[PDB]
Design a protein around this nucleic acid. Structure first.
Ligand SMILES: Cc1cn([C@H]2CC[C@@H](COP(=O)(O)OP(=O)(O)OP(=O)(O)O)O2)c(=O)[nH]c1=O
Ligand SMILES: [Mg+2]
Ligand SMILES: [Zn+2]
Length: 1263
DNA sequence: AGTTTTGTTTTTTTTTT
DNA sequence: AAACAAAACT
RNA sequence: AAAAAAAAA
DNA sequence: TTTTTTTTTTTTTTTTTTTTTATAAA
DNA sequence: AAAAAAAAAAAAAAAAAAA
DNA sequence: AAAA
C-alpha cells in the first residue's frame, strides 16, 4: 500500500520551520506529501529540501504568498509524465505512474474569497487531464456538506454548483464516503468559536475500492490538521548496521560489557565447537544492540509524549462543548510544547556549527569537499542488454548484472597434471627450516591487540554490520575469546560460517561508459573479524617476501619506490638512442582483470613448491574452500553466488599472493636465454614490474618477441592469467622502414610513435622530449585548475592550504620521477600562477618574504617549490653512500669512460678527470647540486669522519683487498672506526688484537696515512646536521622532508618586521622577549583558524587606511573615513578614533568587574604584549577572548561613519562561547572550559535585559 | 632555574596498482 | 601539522 | 566506497 | 700536463616603480 | 607606504692558452 | 558552510 498525506503548513520561509516540517514528514513517512501555503517565492524553491524526499514538485509566485508542493519519498518509484504548475502558485498537477499503475494528483490551495467558484474553474481548465485515476487534495477553504461544520449550516449555492461539477467529473469526497457520519474538523475559527472541515481529499469513484483507510492528523506546525489516505497498490530491503554514535553513551556501554561477559560465561561448554559459538555470540550481540537503541529513543521522547497525551485527553472533549478551563490550558500547553521542539532543534544546529568551526581552512574533510565535486550517487537506472537494447526494468537489470558476475567467477580449472609439469620446468626459490618455522609459529594475544589498535577508522562495515570501532572499544573483553577462536582454527583449518560472506558494490571505472556492464569494478566488503585473521597471516609472510620476490618487482613491496622503474626505463631508452645499430623494442603489457582470473588451485600448488606447508598452508587452504559474495544494487541485497576463481579484491592478503604467483612467470622469462635482453656494460636488463603492470626491453625483436608470446601462452593455460595484445603498446627501433614493416606485420602490438603513458608519466620515444611532454603540460593544467577555483569562498589562509593539499603532491611526484635540469622560467610561472590565486588576483597584503618562516605569521607558511626541487635532486646521494645491490636503476646511465665512479663520489677524495658523466641525464646534475650546498656551508666533503674504509683514500695506498675486508669485518666501515693520530688502533682491545691479523707491509702503509696531522684534523672535526642526514640514517623514510628543512635554514633571508613599525607608531621600544611574546600569542591565542586569522591580520598590519589611499591615489585627502576630521593613521583607526573609544572603555569596565587590574595600553589588546607585572597572570585566556571579540566588532564596520555598539560585541563574544562549549564536552575538556568562561558568563548575564536575552537566545550552558 | 630543541605519536590528504 | 616529554644551552 | 605500498603536511 | 686568465652564469643587494577604492560573512 | 621587479656587482667553475 |  501507498500513503498520501496533505497539509497546509502556513509558511516555510524560516529555516527552523523547514526543519520542524522535515522532522514531522520523516515521522509520518508518507509515500507522497501535498503541502499548501509554502509562501516560498519562485526564487526560494531551492530552500525546500527534505532528507528522504528528494523528488519535489512546486508551483510558486513572485511573492511570499500561496505556494504548493508535492513531495515523493525516495522509497517510491513515481515516474512523472506531466507537471502543470499554476503561474500564481494556487495549484500543481502531476501525472505519472507507480509500479505500472497510472495516478494523477492535483494539489490545490483555494483563495479565502470565492473558493468554490475558483475550484470549479480549475476543474474545467484541467478537464482534459482529470482521468479516472485522479486524486484531488488540499485546502479548499470551504465545507462540502453540512457535517463539515459544527454549526451544521447548509452549504451555499457556489458550493452546490461545485458538488455538481465534482459529480459531473465522476469525482467523490473519499473521506465523507468512508466516514459518512464523521463530525471531525481540520480548522478552528476563533472569531465565531466554530470548527470546520475545509481540507479535503477528493478522487475518482473508480479508485474508491482501493481506499483502505483515511484519517485526520492534528499537529503543532500549523493551524490546520492534516489528512492521510492509504491506497491499495501492488508491490510486484533493510539490513542492520551499527551506529558508532551509540557506543559513546555511558549507560549503553556499561550494559554491553555485562552482557558480553554473561554470554560466554553461560554458553562456554564442550557441547559446541568454538567456531559455531562465535557466530551465535554475534547474533545475540546484534539483537541486544537493537533493543538498547529502541529503548533509548523511546525513553528520550517520554516527556513530549506525556504532554501530547495530556492535550489529546482534552482536545477531543472540545468537540462536544467548550469549557474555559480546558480552552485556556490547551492554548498554554500547545505553545509550550513548541518550545521544547524548538530548543532541541537549535541544539542540533549549534552542534553542527561547532564541529565545522574547528575544521575551517584546515586540511581535513571539509576543505577537500570544497574543491571536489559533489558526490554522484551509486545507482543504475538503465543498462545495455546483450540484444543491444537499452533497458530500464529493475528486475531485468538485476538479472543481467547478477548473471554477468555469477558467470565470470564460475570457471575453475581441472588440469592439475599440467600445473605440475610447468612448475617443474623452472628453478624457483624456497624457504629454509628457520623461515618455515617462523610462519607456522603459534598465535599470541599481543599479536592480536597490535592489529586491532591499527585498524583504520570510519570505514564501512561488512555484511554482519559490526565496525572496527566496536572491537577497539571492547578489546579488553574480546581478545581472550578471539584468541580461543584462532587457536581452534590452528588445530582444525575450519572457519566460522560467516567468515566466507562478503558484500559487493559496483564502481564505474574512470573514463568509461556507464551504459556497459563490462566497465564496472567490484569492491568487496568483508567482516572485521575475518580481516583480522587475514591481517595476521599477511604480516607473517611479509617478513620473508624479499627472499621470494626479485628486485624487478616494486609494487606492494615494503621499502621500494615506484620511481625506480621510471628512471631505469628512461636510461634504457637513452642507450638505444645513442646506439649506432638499431634493432631493439620496448613493450608495455597489462593483465586484464588480474586479481579475478587467478586460478586458485594453481596458486595453492605454487606455495607448496616454495616450501610453504603446515598450519600456515592449511589455514590458507581453508580460506579458499567456499567463499561467496552478495551483490548490493540500488540499495537492495541480491542472491549470493560462489567465487570459484581469483582473489578477494578487498582482502589484505590478496596483494602478496598475487605477486607470488606472478613471480613464477618473471623467473621463467629471466631464465629463458632465447629471449635476448639489452646489455648495458656489465648490466643485462629484461623486465620491470609494478603489481600487474609489466614492461619488457628486448633486443633482436623478430626472434625475441615471438619466444615471449609462446612462454606467456603456456603460462596462461595453467594459471588463467591473460593479456590484451592490442591494448599493449610498443616502441620499435630499426635501421630501415622495410624491416619495420616486416616486424609490424608479424606482431600484434600497437606501435606508439611519440609517447607511452606509464605509471603516471609520459615516456617519450626520444629522451630529448622529456621536459616538453611531462613538465610543459603540468603547468598548463595547474593554470586551468586554479582558474576554476578563482571564486571559491575562503580566505587567503584557506587558499594557501588548498595549494599544499591539491597542487603540492603532484608536483613533488613529478620532480621525484624525472629530476632533469629545469629552466628558471618554470619556477617563475609556477610562483606567479599560484600567488595570483592566493591573493584573489589583487596585490598581496603580506609579502611572501614574511610568510617564508614558521616562526613568523603564527604558523602560516607559503610553500616554496625551488627548495623542494633542490631537496629532491640532492636526495640521490643517499643511495650513493648507502651502497646496495638492489639499486640497478643507479647503474644504467652511460658509462663510456668508467662505470664505478658513483660509489666513490660521496665523502671521498676528488678526481682529476672531469669528462665523466658527459651525457648523464640525472646523476651529473645531482653532483653539481651536492657540491654547491657544501661550499655554501664551507665544508670539505672530501675527507670527513664518515669517510668509508673502502675509499679511494685507502685505495691510493697500495693495500691488498683482503686487508680492507679484514678491517671492515672486525672494526667497522669508516676510517674513524679504525682510529687516527694517537688512537690509530689502540681505540679498543679488539682492534689491538686485530692489528696482527693483517699484512705487516700494509700495516706500515696505513700507519703513515692515519698519523698525518692533516688526516687527524679533518677526521676529528664534529659532524654537521647536513652530514648526518646522508651518513647516519640507514632508512630513506621521510628523506625529502629532512633535506627541505635544512635548505630552509641555509637559504634564510632577512625581512622587514611589522612589529617594529608598531613600535614606531607608538613611542616605545619592544625588547626581544616582548617581540617573542607577540609571536607566541599570535600562534597560541586559539585552536581555530577562524579566530587566529583575525589576530594575525591585526599584528601584520593587513588593513588599508586613508593615509595609504591618499599616497596611492596621489592625493592629499588623508582624513579619517569616519568623519572625525583627524588624519587616518593605523593606530588612529583601532585605538584613538573618538567613535571607537566608547567600546574600549566598555571593555575595561568588564575587566574591572572581573576584579582585574590592567593599564589602558593599546599594545595589550592589539598585540598581546603585557608589562612585566602581568606576565605571570593566569587570566590571559579570558582576556584573549574578550579582546578578539572587540577586534571583530570594529573591523566589521571599518569605514562606516558610526560607532560600534556594545551589544554587537556581546553577541560575537557569546557566539564563541557557544562554539567552544560543544567542542569541550566532545573532547572531554569541560574542566578547562568552565575555568575559562565561568566568571565572564556570570557578568554578561548580569547586564542584559530579559527582553534582550530572549530576543537573542542568550542563556547559560554551564548551569 | 628557564626556554628552546629533538624525537615519537596521532591525525589529515594525494600518488601508483 | 600538533602535542607531549626529555635534554641541553642561556 | 574496500585493499596494499609510497610521499607530504 | 698543469696553472693562470677570461668568460659566463647565478645569486645577492639596492634602487626604482606601481598600487586600490573597507571589511567580515559566505 | 609597502611589495615586487629590474639592474649591477661579486665570485666561482669551466675552457683555452701559456709555461 | 565545506560530513557523516
Ligand atoms: C585501481 C585499483 C586497483 N586495485 C588492484 C586490483 C587489481 C590490480 C590491478 O589493477 P588494474 O588497473 O590492472 O585493474 P584490473 O583488475 O587488472 O582490470 P583491467 O586491467 O582494467 O582489465 O590492482 C585495487 O585493489 N583497487 C583499485 O582501486
Ligand atoms: Mg590489469
Ligand atoms: Zn577617526
Amino acid at each position: 500500500h501507498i500513503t498520501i498525506l496533505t497539509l497546509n503548513i502556513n509558511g516555510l520561509n524560516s529555516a527552523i520551520k523547514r526543519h520542524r516540517l522535515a522532522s514531522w514528514i520523516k515521522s509520518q513517512d508518507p509515500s507522497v506529501c501535498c503541502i499548501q501555503e509554502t509562501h516560498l517565492t519562485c526564487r526560494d524553491t531551492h530552500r525546500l529540501k527534505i532528507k528522504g524526499w528528494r523528488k519535489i514538485y512546486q508551483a510558486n509566485g513572485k511573492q511570499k504568498k500561496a505556494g504548493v508542493a508535492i513531495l515523493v519519498s525516495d522509497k517510491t518509484d513515481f515516474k512523472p509524465t506531466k507537471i502543470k504548475r499554476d503561474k500564481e502558485g494556487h495549484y500543481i498537477m502531476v501525472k505519472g505512474s507507480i509500479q505500472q499503475e497510472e495516478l494523477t494528483i492535483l494539489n490545490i490551495y483555494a483563495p479565502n474569497t470565492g473558493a468554490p467558484r475558483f475550484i470549479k474553474q480549475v476543474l474545467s481548465d484541467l478537464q482534459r487531464d482529470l482521468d479516472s485515476h485522479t486524486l484531488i487534495m488540499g485546502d479548499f477553504n470551504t465545507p462540502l456538506s453540512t457535517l463539515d461544520r459544527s454549526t451544521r449550516q447548509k452549504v451555499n449555492k457556489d458550493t452546490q454548483e461545485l458538488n455538481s461539477a465534482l459529480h459531473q467529473a465522476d469525482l467523490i469526497d473519499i473521506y465523507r464516503t468512508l466516514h459518512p457520519k464523521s463530525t471531525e474538523y481540520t480548522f478552528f475559527s476563533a472569531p465565531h468559536h466554530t470548527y470546520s472541515k475545509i481540507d479535503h481529499i477528493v478522487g475518482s469513484k473508480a479508485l474508491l475500492s482501493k481506499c483502505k483507510r483515511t484519517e485526520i492528523i492534528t499537529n503543532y506546525l500549523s493551524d490546520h490538521s492534516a489528512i492521510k489516505l492509504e491506497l491499495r497498490i501492488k508491490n510486484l530491503s533493510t539490513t542492520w548496521k551499527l551506529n558508532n554514535l551509540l557506543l559513546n553513551d555511558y549507560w549503553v556501554h556499561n550494559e554491553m560489557k555485562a552482557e558480553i561477559k554473561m554470554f560466554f560465561e553461560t554458553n562456554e561448554n564442550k557441547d559446541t565447537t568454538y567456531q559455531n559459538l562465535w557466530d551465535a555470540f554475534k547474533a545475540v550481540c546484534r539483537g541486544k544492540f537493537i533493543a538498547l537503541n529502541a529503548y533509548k529513543r523511546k525513553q528520550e521522547r517520554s516527556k513530549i509524549d506525556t504532554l501530547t497525551s495530556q492535550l489529546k485527553e482534552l482536545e477531543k472533549q472540545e468537540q462536544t462543548h467548550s469549557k474555559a478551563s480546558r480552552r485556556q490550558e490547551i492554548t498554554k500547553i500547545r505553545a509550550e510544547l513548541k518550545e521544547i521542539e524548538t530548543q532541541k532543534t537549535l541544539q542540533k544546529i549549534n552542534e553542527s556549527r561547532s564541529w565545522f568551526f574547528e575544521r575551517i581552512n584546515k586540511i581535513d574533510r571539509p576543505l577537500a569537499r570544497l574543491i571536489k565535486k559533489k558526490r554522484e550517487k551509486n545507482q543504475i537506472d538503465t543498462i545495455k542488454n546483450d540484444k543491444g537494447d537499452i533497458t530500464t526494468d529493475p528486475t531485468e537489470i538485476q538479472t543481467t548484472i547478477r548473471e554477468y558476475y555469477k558467470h565470470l567467477y564460475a570457471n575453475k580449472l581441472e588440469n592439475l597434471e599440467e600445473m605440475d609439469t610447468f612448475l617443474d620446468t623452472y628453478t624457483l626459490p624456497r624457504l629454509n627450516q628457520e623461515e618455515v618455522e617462523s610462519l607456522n609459529r603459534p598465535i599470541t594475544g599481543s599479536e592480536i591487540v597490535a592489529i586491532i589498535n591499527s585498524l583504520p577508522t570510519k570505514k564501512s562495515p561488512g555484511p554482519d554490520g559490526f565496525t572496527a570501532e566496536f572491537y577497539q572499544r571492547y578489546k579488553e573483553e574480546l581478545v581472550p575469546f578471539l584468541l580461543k577462536l584462532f587457536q581452534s582454527i590452528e588445530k582444525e583449518g575450519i572457519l566460522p560460517n560467516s567468515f566466507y560472506e562478503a558484500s559487493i558494490i559496483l564502481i564505474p571505472k574512470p573514463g568509461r561508459d556507464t551504459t556497459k556492464k563490462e566497465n564496472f569494478r567490484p569492491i568487496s566488503l568483508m567482516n572485521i573479524d575475518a580481516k583480522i585473521l587475514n591481517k595476521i597471516l599477511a604480516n607473517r609472510i611479509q617478513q620473508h617476501i624479499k627472499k621470494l620476490i626479485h628486485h624487478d618487482q616494486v609494487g606492494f613491496i615494503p621499502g621500494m619506490q615506484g620511481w625506480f622503474n621510471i628512471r631505469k626505463s628512461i636510461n634504457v631508452i637513452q642507450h638505444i638512442n645513442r646506439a649506432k645499430d638499431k634493432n631493439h623494442m620496448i613493450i608495455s603489457i597489462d593483465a586484464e582483470k588480474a586479481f579475478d582470473k587467478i586460478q586458485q588451485p594453481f596458486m595453492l600448488k605454487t606455495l607448496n613448491k616454495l616450501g610453504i606447508d603446515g598450519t600456515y598452508f592449511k589455514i590458507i587452504r581453508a580460506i579458499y574452500d567456499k567463499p561467496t559474495a552478495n551483490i548490493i544494487l540500488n540499495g537492495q541485497k541480491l542472491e549470493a553466488f560462489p567465487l570459484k576463481t581469483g582473489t578477494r579484491q578487498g582482502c589484505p592478503l590478496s596483494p602478496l599472493l598475487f605477486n607470488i604467483v606472478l613471480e613464477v612467470l618473471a623467473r621463467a622469462i629471466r631464465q629463458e636465454k632465447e629471449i635476448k635482453g639489452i646489455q648495458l656494460g656489465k648490466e643485462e636488463v629484461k623486465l620491470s614490474l609494478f603489481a600487474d603492470d609489466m614492461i619488457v626491453y628486448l633486443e633482436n625483436p623478430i626472434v625475441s618477441a615471438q619466444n615471449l608470446l609462446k612462454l606467456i601462452s603456456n603460462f596462461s593455460k595453467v594459471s588463467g592469467y591473460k593479456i590484451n595484445v592490442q591494448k599493449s603498446q610498443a616502441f620499435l627501433y630499426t635501421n630501415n622502414r622495410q624491416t619495420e614493416s616486416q616486424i609490424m606485420g608479424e606482431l600484434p602490438f600497437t606501435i606508439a610513435s611519440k609517447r607511452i603513458k606509464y605509471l603516471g608519466i609520459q615516456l617519450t620515444r626520444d629522451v630529448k622530449d622529456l621536459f616538453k611532454e611531462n613538465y610543459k603540460p603540468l603547468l598548463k593544467e595547474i593554470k586551468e585548475e586554479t582558474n576554476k577555483w578563482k571564486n571559491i569562498p575562503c580566505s587567503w589562509v584557506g587558499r594557501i592550504n588548498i595549494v599544499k593539499m591539491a597542487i603540492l603532491p603532484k608536483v613533488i611526484y613529478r620532480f621525484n620521477a624525472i629530476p632533469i635540469k629545469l629552466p628558471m622560467t618554470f619556477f617563475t610561472e609556477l610562483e606567479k600562477t599560484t600567488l595570483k590565486f592566493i591573493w584573489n588576483q589583487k596585490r598581496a597584503r603580506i609579502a611572501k618574504s614574511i610568510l617564508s618562516q614558521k616562526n613568523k605569521a603564527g604558523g602560516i607558511t607559503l610553500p616554496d617549490f625551488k627548495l623542494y626541487y633542490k631537496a629532491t635532486v640532492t636526495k640521490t646521494a643517499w643511495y650513493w653512500y648507502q651502497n646496495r645491490d638492489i639499486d640497478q636503476w643507479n647503474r644504467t646511465e652511460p658509462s663510456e669512460i668508467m662505470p664505478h665512479i658513483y660509489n666513490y663520489l660521496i665523502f671521498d677524495k676528488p678526481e682529476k678527470n672531469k669528462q665523466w658523466g658527459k651525457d648523464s641525464l640525472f646523476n651529473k646534475w645531482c653532483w653539481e647540486n651536492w657540491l654547491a650546498i657544501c661550499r655554501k656551508l664551507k665544508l670539505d666533503p672530501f675527507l670527513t669522519p664518515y669517510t668509508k674504509i673502502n675509499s679511494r683514500w685507502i685505495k691510493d695506498l697500495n693495500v691488498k683487498p683482503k686487508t680492507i675486508k679484514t678491517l671492515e669485518e672486525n672494526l667497522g666501515i669508516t676510517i674513524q672506526d679504525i682510529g687516527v693520530g694517537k688512537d690509530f688502533m689502540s681505540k679498543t682491545p679488539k682492534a689491538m688484537a686485530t692489528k696482527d691479523k693483517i699484512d705487516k707491509w700494509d700495516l706500515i702503509k696505513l700507519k703513515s696515512f692515519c698519523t698525518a696531522k692533516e688526516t687527524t684534523i679533518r677526521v676529528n672535526r664534529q659532524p654537521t646536521t647536513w652530514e648526518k642526514i646522508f651518513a647516519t640514517y640507514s632508512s630513506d623514510k621521510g628523506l625529502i622532508s629532512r633535506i627541505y628543512n635544512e635548505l630552509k635554514q641555509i637559504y634564510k633571508k632577512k625581512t622587514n618586521n611589522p612589529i617594529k613599525k608598531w613600535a614606531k607608531d607608538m613611542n616605545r621600544h619592544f625588547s626581544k622577549e616582548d617581540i617573542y611574546a607577540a609571536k607566541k600569542h599570535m600562534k597560541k591565542c586559539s585552536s581555530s583558524l577562524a579566530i587566529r586569522e583575525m589576530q594575525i591580520k591585526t599584528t601584520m598590519r593587513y588593513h588599508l587606511t586613508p593615509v595609504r589611499m591618499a599616497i596611492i591615489k596621489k592625493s592629499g585627502n588623508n582624513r579619517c573615513w569616519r568623519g572625525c576630521g583627524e588624519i587616518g593613521t593605523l593606530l588612529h583607526c583601532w585605538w584613538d578614533c573618538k567613535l571607537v573609544q566608547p567600546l574600549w572603555k566598555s571593555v575595561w569596565r568588564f575587566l574591572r568587574d572581573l576584579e582585574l587590574e590592567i593599564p589602558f595600553d593599546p599594545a595589550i589588546p592589539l598585540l598581546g604584549i603585557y608589562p612585566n607585572e602581568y606576565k605571570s597572570c593566569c587570566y590571559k585566556d579570558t582576556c584573549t577572548r574578550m579582546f578578539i571579540a572587540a577586534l571583530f566588532t570594529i573591523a566589521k564596520t571599518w569605514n562606516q561613519p558610526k560607532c560600534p555598539t556594545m551589544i554587537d560585541w556581546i553577541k560575537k563574544m557569546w557566539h564563541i562561547y557557544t562554539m567552544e562549549y560543544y567542542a569541550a564536552i566532545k573532547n572531554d575538556e569541560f574542566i578547562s572550559f568552565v575555568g575559562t568562561w565561568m566568571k565572564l558568563e556570570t557578568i554578561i548575564l548580569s547586564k542584559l535585559s530579559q527582553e534582550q536575552k530572549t530576543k537573542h537566545r542568550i542563556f547559560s550552558l554551564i548551569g
